[PDB]
Design a protein around this ligand. Structure first.
Ligand SMILES: [Zn+2]
Ligand SMILES: [Zn+2]
Lengths: 827, 827
């Protein structure tokens, strides 16, 4: 049988010795030629249905030879096209002949999912009647026939007649519903065994028909067989067994077997019995009937196996990221933008830490990359872990080189030479190559070379020139399929791609939301937690400045918390001030006012709502823009916020899509929002909390949410330090971690405890919530962290003075984490 | 040549005598069999590419026979499928054999434009190299190849040699880029003339290659030719002549011809010259290269003609109503809904008039329809005129029957027997059948029978049972294609479908607009003329009642005009009152107020806006709905309307989409809206008229716009009376005509004069805009007709006291007409 060779970064199938050349193949016996051709097509079909590979055959001659007319025609039938170069390319070195097979269908959601079949097969074993002949359906015809089946006569008069005279002339000829089969007495029982699978499936697949046994094809005469040889009882059961043996695949309820009518009649010659004749009426079948199992092959594990009949049908008719597939062009342009003229190392943060940690790594990488003048080099601490494989101790880093005029190469750097070094790099290159095809949906020709380098001071195949990345279009298309592959795993670039999907999802909701600037002057935006309410507020001011043609300092941003005010002031898009400064300082020069987290405002310091209305109403261009952003789920106090009653909060805009948190984070928010609705606060208006998110909305970005309880303060602090070190070891930046506590009075106590456990991790410096641009871990209270967002958030002991607000601190906490969240509740 | 015979309601091609039956067809010589097969395939290809038809052949035998294996295989290659029944079905009666060919591609915008090719061809004459063999591209392969082309070596060393030793062995074998050809000296000149056509386009279509003449294929030995026969100088001329004769179709600029390198080298034997060898290098071609003209046929006029190379490429690579195709399912249910259990006559208005004028027509039609128990019978005064054909005097009516278990039949009822009557019905049935396929996009098997009935007291071809409408699915799918056919012409059913498309376009814009009820309480809707501003006002009040669960009388509708108030009050959806009644009566029990055409209000009676706010704000559910609908393009006075300044008119919804007027009417409005912007009224605010329609919005509904000037007052009336009579003759109801004059004081003058000329047309009854339910022609002033709409509108002598308002009456008048408008301006 055919087995896959495991010492290569591809699917290599060795078929043994194959005679090549039409002159050499003609001299062979038909049986041997058929066996060799069948083995070659088995390998080719397996590689077409398994994502591509190489077919290795050893030829009996030294000089170059052609593959052969029969093999070429069989491959053409396999791919149903004369474009034989687009899938198969041949090379030969010495006594070995190679055929490099491309993948037929690439990706789980191909662009031609509803057009071309998923499987290539030698024969589908689906016969249907075509006028006076029985023909087999190829892959496209079988696909169309199964699609059709998936959705929800003069011959009768002879059939009812009970006896037939010898030599009777049948008026009707052979046609779509009538077949005349000559019945021979020498192999009469063998003849019945073989003719049933050929014609019964043909009629049942197309409207049914009649099958006459014992009637000459040309002369249409009734002859039958010898009455001595034929046993009508023994003959009847064999036909019944043969018809019931045919495999049938049902797409409907019920699933009754094949319905047919068998009639055995006496043949009379000169008024004397001469023999028996067989009439078969096959009723049309509600589904497909197979003459035998389909001849389609696929590679599972290290073996080549044939697909079962029910498994073949399922593939013909029928973590994956939906968001990554549609945004793959913009995601690639952000992270993996190919640079013209020089070779770029990504990530730059991880590359810098690698060269400083290991001496000589910078010079080793540069010496190997001299021949390459353009491309991108993607670094990682272990590319096997990024592909859910096992890490090999002693590997410094893995690099995937995607350069022009060169096939992709996966470099593995070892700090000392190891016997398993080449085996580890080969398995990761082979795994990455298969994912780029079967998961990233790459429709081109791709091969990943496995190269091993050592820091301290089997042969690869020579792929055809069409496997090399010729220009920008091929490298860009290959990188876009790597984005889909990366988004399905957990790694450094999986999260950096996951972060950019959230920014693309938020920009989609903003475009719908940004249309309200021309229609409204005073607007009350009721956003939901994690819906990007703060992000739109920043985006509108960029649009307000352009639309109204006012300078930046005319727009005023008012918030409740000091740390968020600093964030807005850093971007220089407006003047950002706290509520207290808004009431105290005079703002007669302000034209437009944007208010954020209005539910957290307080009225004891003054009447902020009236003053904001007065300033905007008295603008030069009539009424100015006064957009009030608020979310009643994140109310931080039980006092009166000074807002008008819910009836007067019009016109109103609603943000219901959660577009700033990962999938497990979003599910946590929606589950927690249900608890808030069941126990509304007394100060909160009754009808405001009746807001529901989108019925079926998924961010398509995977994250992490772990709850660890019954841990002491010392025990919690080590877990935070260990998790941060694990993230920083993989290459994350320290500016992606935020630690949030219940109250601002406990910030100083937890800060000393955090440094005590984190001093062992080579970082002893933290930043406050007031400084977000610093490359330090932010440790501050949840309430003072409102309006900000971080990639990794650790919540330590969520607590508040009033148990009524206790359900509200969690939702104000989980909404601050974009991808990773770790909560350590009270014991 | 093959010519279609014009005596049937289909494309019938007579191919003459054809031998049928495999036993009979085996006995013929290859030449005669090939000629017969090629004739049959020409007919089949013509009918496949021409919309379907019948192939008539006269067989030489009486008993039923099969068509033959070779013909079946040729048809299978023609349709590229073994499903030979879905396109060809055979019938035989006596000495004639019929093949009923279905259309390959139906409609100008099929569902498979990018999936299946448009043309069926015997051969595309496109050859491409397939490994070591040259293969011709089928229709699908040629389609894919042209789609790809439309988007914007050891053999070299031997080529550089200047002489070749006799018997030299070429190291390389024949491959994708190398071809070895033996050169025969007996017919050496004629050999070259035919070798170039099939091999040079093969290389040029796929990356190019090398062509060697004079080398043995099997042994790779260089032989050349004899010196006495081959002349190197003259041999070059024909080779470059033959390569330049290949037709080439370019998709790009520039269009340089095929580029190749020719070298003729001496063949030396034992150091002595023996002959010449020809080496050809073919550079890859930027576009497709044809060995000869494609073998595709089509029926044009009364002949069967072959498509030229330039035309064949265009069809394979590349009035029609786009809106009709989208809404064909909804349009069918409104008009042509098949009734289960009885036969329905449409239109009912035309059916009633037909039986009244002509005695015995009801008895004749009912007698003919007895066998049919289900379906729809579509009546018309002349179906030929509906299809842009010529009217035949003496025809009472034409009826198209679409019934269950019966092919469509077009009945032509004649007052008296006429010899031409059968020709008239056959030509209309043939035209209607082709429109249903080539224009309506019907992908099934359709035949339209032509039957002639006479009120006063060639054989019909028997189509197969697959042409009969078996059930509701086939009848429904056939009528949806008739909807698209009708919408492309000008007729009664074309206009009734045009009115329903406008009602579906308005319902599309309402769904977008209806989302503002949840977000707004006070709203200022700035609509454009013809945008359906009044229609949304009625639809909103039905949504307000459902959403707020209030009783119907709780909603108040306020309008300036009395005729508009009457129309709204008749629908029993709210309380409709005039502005004057609003200020006079007390409405303390009203919760929601909807104001329409607010730009026509006046302050001479009091503050209507102030009273509106007080009633709505004091509602039980806080602030009630107060939506103000206005259109500044249709202001009927220069006084103050009482609306707040343009700066205080917020929030806003803008209806910019013209969805209530046909295409000619809509283009007239936008042209006139430009004049209004070029000179706004002084009372009109500065920035309100800056509302623009969509950049590219088309209704896709045909209409009529005719402007006749310099006619006297008497001449206007007879034109209106004649136009009304011709419309009523076709079956248009009188309630579709409105006559609009400039001022209400001239209404009585024009009413008397219109009746003077219209009395000759058997209609004397006129009505005012206060009553629109009556089946009468409405005649009032333009300003009095605000808010209402009619299908046919006649504008007579537009005029106003102030020339500033002069452009305002035309835009207000034109917006009243939905499909037909006739303007008679002052001379
Ligand atoms: Zn079934
Ligand atoms: Zn070109």
């Amino acid at each position: 049988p055919l087995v896959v060779e495991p010492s290569y970064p591809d699917l290599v199938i060795n078929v043994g010795e194959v005679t090549l050349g039409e002159e050499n193949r003609k001299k062979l016996q038909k049986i041997q030629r058929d066996q060799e051709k069948e083995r070659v097509m088995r390998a080719a079909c397996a590689l077409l249905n398994s994502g591509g590979g190489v077919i290795r055959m050893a030829k009996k001659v030294e000089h170059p030879v052609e593959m052969g007319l029969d093999l070429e025609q069989s491959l053409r039938e396999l791919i149903q096209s004369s474009d034989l170069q687009a899938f198969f390319e041949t090379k030969q070195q010495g006594r070995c002949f190679y055929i490099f097979v491309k993948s037929w269908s690439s990706g789980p959601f191909p662009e031609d999912r509803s057009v071309k079949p998923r499987l290539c097969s030698l024969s589908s074993s689906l016969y249907r009647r075509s006028e006076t002949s029985v023909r087999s359906m190829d892959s496209r015809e079988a696909f169309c026939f199964l699609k059709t089946k998936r959705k929800p006569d003069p011959a009768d008069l002879i059939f009812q007649k009970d006896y037939l005279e010898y030599g009777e002339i049948l008026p009707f000829p052979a046609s779509q519903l009538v077949e005349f089969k000559q019945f021979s007495t020498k192999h009469f029982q063998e003849y019945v065994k073989r003719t049933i699978p050929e014609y019964v499936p043909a009629f049942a697949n197309t409207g049914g028909g009649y099958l006459f046994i014992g009637v000459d094809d040309k002369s249409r005469e009734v002859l039958g067989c010898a009455k001595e040889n034929v046993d009508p009882d023994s003959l009847r059961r064999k036909i019944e067994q043969a018809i019931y043996k045919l495999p049938c695949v049902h797409f409907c309820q019920p699933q009754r077997p094949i319905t047919f009518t068998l009639k055995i009649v006496n043949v009379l010659k000169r008024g004397e019995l001469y023999g028996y004749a067989c009439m078969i009426r096959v009723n049309p079948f509600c589904c497909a009937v197979f003459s035998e199992a389909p001849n389609s092959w696929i590679v599972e594990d290290k073996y080549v196996c044939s697909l079962t009949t029910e498994k073949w049908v399922g593939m013909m008719t029928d973590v994956y990221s939906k968001k990554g597939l549609e945004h793959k062009k913009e995601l690639q342009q952000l992270l993996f933008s190919v640079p013209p003229g020089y070779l770029r190392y990504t990530p730059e943060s991880l590359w810098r830490d690698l060269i400083s940690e290991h001496r000589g790594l910078e010079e080793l990488i540069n010496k190997q990359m001299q021949p390459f003048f353009r491309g991108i080099l993607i670094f990682s601490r272990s590319w096997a872990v990024d592909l859910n494989l096992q890490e090999k101790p002693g590997v410094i880093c893995d690099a995937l080189l995607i350069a022009q005029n060169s096939t992709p190469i996966l470099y593995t750097i070892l700090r000392e030479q190891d016997a398993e070094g080449q085996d580890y790099c080969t398995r990761t290159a082979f795994t990455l190559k298969q994912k780029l095809v079967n998961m990233g949906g790459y429709t081109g020709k791709v091969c990943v070379r496995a190269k091993v380098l050592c820091l301290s001071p089997v042969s690869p195949m020579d792929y055809p020139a069409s496997y090399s990345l010729a220009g920008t279009q091929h490298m860009e298309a290959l990188l876009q399929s790597l984005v889909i592959v990366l988004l399905g795993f957990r790694s450094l670039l999986s999260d950096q791609l996951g972060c950019e999907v959230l920014n693309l999802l938020t920009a989609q909701q903003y475009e719908i939301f940004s249309r309200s600037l021309r229609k409204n002057r005073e607007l009350f935006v009721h956003g939901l937690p994690g819906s990007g309410k703060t992000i739109m507020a920043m985006k509108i001011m960029e649009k307000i400045r352009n639309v109204f043609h006012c300078e930046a300092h005319r727009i005023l941003y008012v918030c409740e918390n000091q740390p968020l005010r600093n964030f807005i002031s850093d971007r220089n898009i407006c003047r950002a001030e706290t509520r207290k400064t808004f009431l105290r300082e005079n703002f007669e020069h302000i034209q437009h006012i944007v208010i954020d987290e209005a539910q957290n405002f307080r009225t004891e310091d003054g009447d902020w709502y009236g003053k904001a209305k007065s300033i905007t109403r008295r603008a030069k261009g009539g009424p100015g823009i006064l957009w009030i952003f608020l979310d009643y789920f994140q109310t931080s106090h039980l006092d009166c916020s000074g807002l008008p009653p819910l009836s007067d909060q019009y016109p109103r805009e609603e943000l219901t899509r959660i577009v700033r948190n990962a999938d497990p984070i979003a599910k946590y928010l929606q589950k927690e929002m249900q608890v808030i609705r069941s126990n509304p606060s007394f100060n909160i208006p009754t009808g405001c909390l009746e807001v529901f998110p989108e019925a079926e909305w998924s961010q398509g970005v995977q994250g992490t949410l772990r709850i660890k309880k019954y841990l002491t303060v010392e025990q919690i602090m080590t877990c935070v330090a260990d998790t941060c070190r694990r993230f920083f070891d993989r290459g994350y930046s320290p500016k992606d971690v935020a630690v949030l506590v219940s109250t601002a009075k406990e910030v100083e106590h937890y800060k000393y405890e955090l440094l005590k456990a984190m001093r062992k991790k080579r970082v002893v410096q933290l930043s406050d919530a007031c400084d977000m641009l610093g490359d330090h871990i932010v440790l501050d209270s949840v309430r003072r962290f409102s309006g900000l967002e971080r990639s990794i958030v650790f919540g330590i002991h969520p607590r508040t003075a009033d148990p009524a607000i206790l359900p509200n601190v969690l939702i104000c906490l989980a909404s601050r984490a974009k991808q990773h969240l770790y909560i350590f509740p009270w014991g």
